[PDB]
Write a protein that binds this DNA or RNA. Sequence first.
DNA 1: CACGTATGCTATAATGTGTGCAGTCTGACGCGG
DNA 2: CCGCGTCAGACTCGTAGGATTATAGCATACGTG
RNA 3: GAGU
Lengths: 277, 1173, 79, 49
Amino acid sequence: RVLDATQLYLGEIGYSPLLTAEEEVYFARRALRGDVASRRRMIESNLRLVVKIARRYGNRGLALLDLIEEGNLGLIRAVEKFDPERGFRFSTYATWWIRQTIERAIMNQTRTIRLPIHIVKELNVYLRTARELSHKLDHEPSAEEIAEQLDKPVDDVSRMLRLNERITSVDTPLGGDSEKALLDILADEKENGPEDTTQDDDMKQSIVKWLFELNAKQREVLARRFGLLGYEAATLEDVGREIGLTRERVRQIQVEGLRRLREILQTQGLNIEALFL
Amino acid sequence: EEFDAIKIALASPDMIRSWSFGEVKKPETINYRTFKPERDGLFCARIFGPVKDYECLCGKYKRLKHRGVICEKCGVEVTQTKVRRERMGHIELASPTAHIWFLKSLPSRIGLLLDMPLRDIERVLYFESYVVIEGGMTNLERQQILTEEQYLDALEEFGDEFDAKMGAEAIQALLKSMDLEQECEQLREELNETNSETKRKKLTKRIKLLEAFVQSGNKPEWMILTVLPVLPPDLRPLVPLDGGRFATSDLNDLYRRVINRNNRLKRLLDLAAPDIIVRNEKRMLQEAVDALLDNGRRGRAITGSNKRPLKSLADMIKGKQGRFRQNLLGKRVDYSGRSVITVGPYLRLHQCGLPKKMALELFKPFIYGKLELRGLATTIKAAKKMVEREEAVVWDILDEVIREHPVLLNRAPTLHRLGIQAFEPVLIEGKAIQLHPLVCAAYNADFDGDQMAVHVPLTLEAQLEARALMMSTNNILSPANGEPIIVPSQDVVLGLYYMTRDCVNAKGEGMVLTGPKEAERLYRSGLASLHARVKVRITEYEKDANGELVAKTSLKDTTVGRAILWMIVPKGLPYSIVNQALGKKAISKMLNTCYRILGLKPTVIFADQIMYTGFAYAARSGASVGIDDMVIPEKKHEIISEAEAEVAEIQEQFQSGLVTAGERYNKVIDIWAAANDRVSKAMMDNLQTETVINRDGQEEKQVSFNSIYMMADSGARGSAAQIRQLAGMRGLMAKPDGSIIETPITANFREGLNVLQYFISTHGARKGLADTALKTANSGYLTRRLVDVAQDLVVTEDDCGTHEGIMMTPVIEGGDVKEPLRDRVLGRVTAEDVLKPGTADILVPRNTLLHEQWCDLLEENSVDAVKVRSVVSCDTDFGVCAHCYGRDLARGHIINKGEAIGVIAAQSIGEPGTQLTMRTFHIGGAASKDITGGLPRVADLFEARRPKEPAILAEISGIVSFGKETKGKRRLVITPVDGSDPYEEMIPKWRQLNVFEGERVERGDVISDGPEAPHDILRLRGVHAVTRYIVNEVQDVYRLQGVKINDKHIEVIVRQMLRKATIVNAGSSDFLEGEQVEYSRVKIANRELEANGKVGATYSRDLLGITKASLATESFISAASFQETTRVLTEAAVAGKRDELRGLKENVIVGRLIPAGTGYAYHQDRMRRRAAG
Amino acid sequence: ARVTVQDAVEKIGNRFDLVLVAARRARQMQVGGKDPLVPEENDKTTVIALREIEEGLINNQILDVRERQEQQEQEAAEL
Amino acid sequence: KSDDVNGRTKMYKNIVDGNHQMEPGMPESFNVLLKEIRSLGINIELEDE
DNA sequence: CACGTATGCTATAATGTGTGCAGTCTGACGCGG
DNA sequence: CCGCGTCAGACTCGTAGGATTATAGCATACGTG
RNA sequence: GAGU
Ligand SMILES: [Mg+2]
Ligand SMILES: [Mg+2]
Ligand SMILES: [Zn+2]
Ligand SMILES: [Zn+2]
């Protein structure tokens, strides 16, 4: 038993009869007028065209079957927008739709990081131009050589070529030996080590001790306003509203408290100065 | 955070939706420009959480000021970024899809449950043909496949009243509508009609499936997936490399395929597309899902541009690269370092040289903490910068911290526990680790560039564990055999040999010396040789009946050298031990004696002392290797020419056409083997006693002091075999075929081989070396399986209160006392006395550990055989008792409860194989087998494979009656006395029986010649029979290679093999026929049956190979982590199995505290908390 | 105690429980700052604990006794 | 010493404060295993105490 | 309005795949015909 | 039984980074500063 | 490539 997805599908398409021009016209008149059968028969009879075209466009976009399905989607657009009355053949019209749809599909799905059509098409012209350049310059083309050819900014060219930088698999092992790969080397940079984490504890706690050295009033004003021992960085009006009306007095006590902290530092700053790394 | 147990069951569509916090409807990962997650994509931050802690995406809500806020603009919750690794999503499949694991991974499960062949299911799934889900008309039955054209016929004819469909839909529907209860009873009815053997198995299998399916609460619909879960972003990361590259997991590519195909399917359905296109897309969908879950399972694995198959989900759980093996049972570790090792002769046994630079980093936080107590460092930043600058006060602090702090040294491969040992570090300037010589044995460490790993025990508990359990001084004896593993080697032996050995007169023959101090003085003054024969007054202490020591002064006849060594000897030991010429073999016994009389502390000091003096005298000797030291016997050329004329005779007899080629080949080979033996004898006579050159009256004969002979005689290095190749004849070489070359190598290495001799040597050499590299995998794999099956076994109890045990005889295989009774039985509990009135009046009561004392008494009394308590015969459920095990061989006393004995057993049995696979192969060169033949025999034993042509045994006692013959094939019409009904058995024609019919036959009397199957032994002669068969048959291999392992280790594993028992006849519970349950649980049930009466359960114990026994443990985490993980997980998921985490494996995986050793105390406290609610 | 732990093991018996006992004692000295019986002689907490056990001063049951004694007096103080 | 994130940081601070206390939790790699299994479509849940 | 991102349509006729490799490993243990 | 399939196959250390292809050209449309 |  053939369980090949592909072979099964190709067998089934094979067993639908190819159409002549008059047949296509008759069917299609009724298809535009809505004959569920007509549309189906035209589709199914012309699947073989789709496979011929998807055969070409494959190569390196996508799996043959993936191309075939997108191609079928193009063929369906063609059957919906076919004009029987115009003397032009169906196969001719459908070809355009099928190729269009396949190409557009391989421009959005072919890349892990989805590149917009605009970027992709820009980039492609940079590529084809690079190829002509390399055809006469023997050696491959520089960013500025391609840019000189297009009469455009080098930054433009460079940014496009940066986007063309294709992905690396985290699981692909390094050194031919199937041992450790990229994941095996790659750190978590965001997650600090217990050394950095413990240094912050020490910092934050030394600031508590320093805050208690100051006046009860200064320390409370600083705590509430900085959002240090409080929850929220209370604005001048919030702190004043809870203690002493005078919003201006919060600024006074706050600035006073900062300057007393500077005195502790000029005296015992011998520890604080070493916090500059 | 702390749970008790873990359950696996089928994932319902609805359950998958519960985990999900968003439906991923797009393949878009991130935006090309602002590398931020794309809407409803694989990395959607609206679904999986914020990229930055407490920040929404568009940046509207920032910090903790906005806690659980959900941004109206972007739609992102503001929380910890932590959640991106936690939150899952899901995908709505348009068409249902089969779960490949519950389809392809055999047994079929889905196929097994519908009783539908796997091919049949597949034809349905891939839309080759229809299946009838309900033919209301009995005309068409259920699950009967119809081809495309078959569906057209009944379409007009029956139609309506038959529903037959195609694809995953059909199968899901078929599964949904099957009622498990009813069909179970129907199949049980059919089981009674004519249950043939294979039919009964398959029926009982579905019966147990249906039963387990209802017990799990799983539904068959769930075999089919409609909702597909999506793994969290951070567990399939898309990260930017420095250079603007991106690197992603393969899973993202696989998921992008699925999403695209599924969303295209939805489009095709919206457009009402023709059915052939709908079909292709459904197949497409199934393909991509199958690839996502398990890639290279169903067909060609979907490949990258690299050619290499993409790594799917299952690949991350499965195999060595898998989670379990690689990241869970073994881990990368902080506070670990490594370097080259070199000798530390000066070190004492409990010390190691630890490079300053290395130690400074390893103890970083300890240094910062002490810096803050000294008030030297104001803050952590300052402390850090102080250690970077490496200030002189920091060195004082570092020195302070490392005092009394043990560190662990490890060497790969870690084959037994002594491959990791603890030491007090001694800080040294210079980049290599210094290791103590005497423990080089255990590490198998030689300093040809070897490296070792260093680990810092952090906690007070770990430090205590290291100093108490793992310290080198504390762990001397091999846990495998009761022997000291720290023994002097090489130069040390050589030196001790040099001092003790005697020469004729020499300097100051027949002097009289006051004490060994006078001897030392005289030697070092240069008025006496070390080998001078002399009279000396030594005071030797003999320890009394109690702890008090009784000394006795005696004038002995010994050398100056021996007297001086007596100073190293502790008081307590006798002088006659050192009075002989010392070698490696005498010195191991020396150490042993010291351990048994004095104890640990004395022996440790003594060992170091012996090392110092050994090397010291080795150097003084001036012992070296010149070409003159390799003495060729004068009669080589004669012997050889004779052997050549002899071979010529047989060649001429061949040319005459009389003597065959094979006869000549054999006679030539025998000629050369015998010539080789003769030349070797000549070499050794001429060397061993070549000191025919002595004195005092006139000429006298004596032992040779030639350097190579000394090295070999002492056991320090070389042996007669080696020396044969050096001074003698090299001998006959073996081809890579294994066949021997006709021409041997007449030359030796001193003589130098010619082109042809050298070439001929190469084959064998290289064969050996290849064996080291390649076969150690198979040896080590054995180690792993043993370890896995013995894991759980721990000492649970002190005394099981059993009277059971095995009767050990002294192994007189052939004639020679292979393993004396004493050595086989020492340190075992006596189960049962034997009163034979005798000479020393010995009863030796029950439950007595055999001390060396009681063992000596056995020898005087000539005890024949003895019942000894054994692991296999223990009654303790969920482990064994200290009594049934006996002595912890590594300690020299009774085993402590809590010790993980199984692991020790497996390591002890496995290691020698694994090591000898490297030893006689890097080395194994010339031919005069080995391990490569032996271990396959051993593996076939532990795996309980029935042999190719097995011996036949009598099943039941009675009278033998021979009957009829089918053209030579022997039938047997046997008729017992009380069970009068006849029993018949067919035997092959050419197989001849050793016994002769018509006989009174006990159960398990051997009829045929052939190997015994362990199962059949168990079934006829019970546990002691099969246990003793395996122990003995295994030990034969290891004994051939000179490997000492105590029987009790193999007994441990045997017991693990006999874990399970098939019940044949119903109990009061829901056991019933054919279920196989653990013997522990059914005996505990029988204790409750005894109490309550009711129907007793008739069972029969079954033997299982090591692999299957581990897979049969109730713990599915242990099973899955071992092997077969795709299958193990489908089994457990369907069964709805729960693991309550009793075993060590299981705990280690979850990073908990081991239920053994130190952890036994805490674990039993937890267990009593579980028992009281 | 430092080099060989044999006599210490002979006092308690079970190696594993010796570990637990000495660690619980060493934790007291480390955190609570509980006073050592034997002279430190410049030795670390763990070594102190092992000496103490060897000489037969510390015991699992004895630790449980001092725990209850002092905790009970604290409860009495509360009430 | 390995995965336990909370544990490692807490342990470090304890070590700097002398008290060699063990404060262990659950290895993150285990968590991940479960998630990997659930992405497979097997429900594997912890039943707690 | 503009910029970035997207969808769209095109009419000589064309109507069943392949492609690039895989190199064969082994001793064992079950499972449909 | 035969034959095809699936499953296993030592431990630590190292080195070095890294690959490819190509998707027309233009007109209209939708969302945010 | 390093020691098994
Ligand atoms: Mg060596
Ligand atoms: Mg070496
Ligand atoms: Zn926002
Ligand atoms: Zn017992």
